[PDB]
Structures are given as structure tokens and as C-alpha cells.
Amino acid sequence: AVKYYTLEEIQKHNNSKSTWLILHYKVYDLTKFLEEHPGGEEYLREQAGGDATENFEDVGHSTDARELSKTFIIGELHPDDR
Ligand code: HEM
User: Fold this and answer.
1) Nearest CA owner, ligand 1 atom 18
2) Domain residue spans in the chain?
3) Strand partners, 59
4) Whose CA is closest to atom 33 on ligand 1?
5) Which residues are noted in the entry as heme-binding?
6) 37 marked ligand binding residue
7) 24 in contact with ligand 1, CB cutoff 6 A
8) CA of 43: how far to CAs of 9, 16, 50, 54, in Å?
9) What is the dihedral sign for C-alpha 7, 10, 14, 20?
């Protein structure tokens, strides 16, 4: 089973208690990761509530970071919004 979120609901998660973002159609809840992110939290908050795939790939994340990102997935972008 997979949970699908719309762009409308994702955009609402960009505040002090909730930070979500999209990477390759998958939705990530990075709320508790902000402080641990090697790159800092400014880059994450700035992209919160939207699709950060291009920025993510632009910086060029390691295979380890990508493996780690998987633990933060909570669902996928609704097919109709793709
Ligand atoms: C769940 C997603 C993410 C995880 C788990 C994550 C993890 C990491 C890790 C482990 C590093 C260390 C270097 C490496 O292994 O590549 C890193 C660096 C970095 N990340 Fe992320 N990252 C994520 C999302 C993002 C996003 C969305 C942005 C930008 C919009 C971003 C910007 C950066 C920057 C600027 C660095 C520093 C690169 C440098 O100094 O050369 N990261 N990230």
C-alpha cells in the first residue's frame, strides 16, 4: 500500500513543526533531519513544501546520502499532479 499526497497538501508542510519536500515524486518528511543535515538547514527549509529534485541532484549527493534519505519517505506525489 502507498499513500499519495497532492501538491496542495504538501505545500502546507513548511513551518516550524513540519518540513516536507518532494524528490523524484516521493514525499519526504525531513522535520527531524534538518539539524542533522551536513549541508545545513537553510537549503532544506528554502525548498520545503515543494519539489527539490533538481536542487538535490545539482549538488550531487553521495550513494550513502541517497540510501539514508529513504528512511524519511512517507508517501508519493498523487499521479494526477505529476
Ligand atoms: C532526504 C534528503 C537529503 C539527505 C538525506 C541529505 C543528505 C546529505 C548528506 C549525507 C550530505 C553529505 C555529502 C554527501 O553525502 O553527499 C549532504 C550535503 C549537502 N546537501 Fe543534502 N541531503 C538531502 C537533501 C538536500 C536538499 C534537498 C538540498 C538542497 C536543496 C541539499 C543540499 C546539500 C548541500 C549544499 C550539501 C553540501 C555539499 C557540499 O558542501 O559540497 N541536500 N546532504
Assistant:
1) 39
2) 1-82
3) none
4) 39
5) 37, 61
6) yes
7) no
8) 21, 15, 13, 13
9) negative
Q: What is the DSSP letter of 50?
A: S
Ligand 1: residue of 29, 55, 56 to mutate (most ligand atoms within 8 A of CB) is 56
This PDB structure is determined at a resolution in Å of: 1.9
Residue 27 in 3-state DSSP? strand
Amino acid identity at 76: E
14 within ligand 1 shell (Cβ under 6 A): no
Give the Å distances, CA to CA, from 15 to 9, 37, 38, 57.
13, 17, 21, 24
| Straight-line distance from the first to the last Cα atom of the chain, in angstroms, rounded to the nearest whole number | 19
The residue type found at 62 is S
Q: Which CATH number fits domain 1-82: 3.30.70.1060, 1.20.1530.20, 3.90.830.10, 3.10.120.10?
A: 3.10.120.10
- With cell 505529476, the residue in question is 82
